[PDB]
């Protein structure tokens, strides 16, 4: 896909992980703003990328990777992990039947006439309170987690990181780029300065280290 | 055992077991029914130790079909109750613990396998009970719903008195009898507030002047 | 409109306030039930009356006349009462402008740059906490209030009172019937015994006191 | 006045007025930024009386455009604040009371006229303030939003320290200057955490070994 705005000679292609450097403070500021307020001067497309289809990250530690929407997707994912393990899943079914059986007995014994449905694997997973751990995150760890929840969000097409290179070591930028490619994601890193020596675009428009 | 008293009453009307109280004057009937709804006040219910029966200890029914046997208040009581049955069979509890610890590891196993750094807390018995969807079985007549209400009333130990308002009009003579039989066996204390005599069962009758007579003893 | 079910020789017409007596305990019970569970053996129509279009009252003191939906209608009603009093409404506008003016001044004086919209009559009415008083109701008073909120509910077509005559004096039944007719309502009173000497239907099917 | 200290620091870095702290090593920068987010802990902020600055007394910003000047937390503070301005002008309060009592009667008048038996409570100043929809005016640049954030930070007396993270990258030299001027006039205590030197302003610079030098004094 592509980024374009009127002052570009030609669209900036966005394939996999793209590092875009805006060395002029005023233009760094304006482009970050247009991204933030995308709806618009700046265009991503040759169908246009809707606003809802873009996720923008400026505060890494503050970004919520444990939204109801994401947890649902994680939990579903975990359940589907069992569908590749018929032997183990069947055992779980048997453990839950035994549990169900002990509970239904307590129901019979209760003075009330009680009824019930069933306990599901998904319900067990929800009850266990599974979520992404983030309390201890380093900034790099959290970047990875965002990438990883991003992959679940089939609706979202572009992830944009704002001014994040400053927090990452060379090997860390390396590790993130590698994960992006392995996962077929599309991610834009908006930077105010050249980010080490990775392939990257620079508007003063050139490319460096290809 | 129990007592119903207020200002205009010559004597307190005793509530023992199932009691049919006929308020023959419309105005008296409405007054008393209204007072029950407004209980907090003019009219008093108290046990034999002269301890007052509190609002919260009374269950007041006029809309039989509407009464919700599966109210959140009730379901929470039951789920808690089920959990506690477990907490009194240490061997069964132990079994529950082993099964949940194992299902837990198996799930956490998939968590580790997952790309994401995942944490979690624990699965509790209450959570299993709530996930299984335990609830009170649900009755295709008003008489049948009355029995159910009685069963719930007996289940709820904190509710001490059940008042049915104007329900006689819905019950055959055999049904009234079935009701009072259940009430007898299970030792309930139930007040049937009626606007007129209810067949020929023993019952109190209170006239225009709040004078009490019994009938069919 | 009409009530019908298979055991009737002919539909029972429902015009204004109708008293229907079911002297057989078993049939009183069954018909109350079918009303309760209307969706169905019992028919009200020659288009059929949808279930949502019927309001059923068995517990008079317990019925909620202060629902969000009703309050909205009451409050709107009150506002529209002002639209027939241009002089007074204009004065209220002037009182509220003065209020607005004192508040906006406090806004100017506040260190923050503050903005605002306007205070409306409807907002004043909501803020005042206007609702039907019910805490002290006698059963008769409450019957009247239900009738009175019923009139607001343009969607609802039939109100049914179950076994309520027992609570009402002759003059009270009289007063309710009178209000029903004056307000062009349609109301069914289901009774287990003859209700004094009003015009009424009786299934043992006859009419009495016409 | 204020101090930033922790384990690896030779000396505590003083926070007086507007402070630009350059952490030149990526790892140090990330470590410190991460520690600010996790503040509750390794890193300490304390005033001159050695009283600790609490989590709640710090305002930590990285996402400038995202900061919500009209948060429910803030709006409640402001509305309360507006009410209290009234409670200190007895003559104006008095005027407010008269106007509300009159509008009230006029409304209650329509209530009496209404068929329904209507009750009500009262209209309060807070309710008028909230009905009028008072809120903070809203800025079409990041620099402009920074000023707004500073204005809010000054307004919130319980917030004692403001930390901007990596915001230098967005500001021209004249804008940084405008910011620190506002901070000076209004006496704010602001920490700018930067990954590299910020133009040629006075600033602390902390190296790989947590040795501190000042620059451009
Ligand atoms: Ca289930
Ligand atoms: Ca983590
Ligand atoms: Ca849990
Ligand atoms: Ca408004
Ligand atoms: Ca009233
Ligand atoms: Ca109020």
Numbering used by the authors:
A (entry chain A), C (entry chain A): 1 to 39, 42 to 47, 51 to 209, 214 to 219
B (entry chain B), D (entry chain B): 0 to 39, 42 to 139, 141 to 219
What did the publication describing this PDB structure actually write?
Mounting evidence indicates that CRISPR and Cas proteins represent a microbial immune system that protects against invading foreign genetic elements, such as plasmids and phages. The results of the mobility shift assay indicate that S. pyogenes Csn2 has a non-specific dsDNA-binding function.
The asymmetric unit of the structure contains two S. pyogenes Csn2 monomers, three calcium ions, 204 water molecules and two ethylene glycol molecules. In the asymmetric unit, the two S. pyogenes Csn2 monomers form a dimer with approximate two-fold non-crystallographic symmetry. The only CA2 site in the asymmetric unit of the S. pyogenes Csn2 structure is located adjacent to one of the two hinge regions in monomer A. The calcium ion in the CA2 site is coordinated by three residues (Glu138, Asp142, and Glu150) from monomer A, Asp118 from monomer B of the symmetry-related dimer, and two water molecules. Residues in the hinge region of monomer A are structurally stabilized by the calcium ion bound in the nearby CA2 site, which is missing in monomer B. Such heterogeneity suggests that calcium binding in S. pyogenes Csn2 is important not only for its oligomerization, but also for its conformational diversity, enabling calcium-dependent conformational changes in the protein.
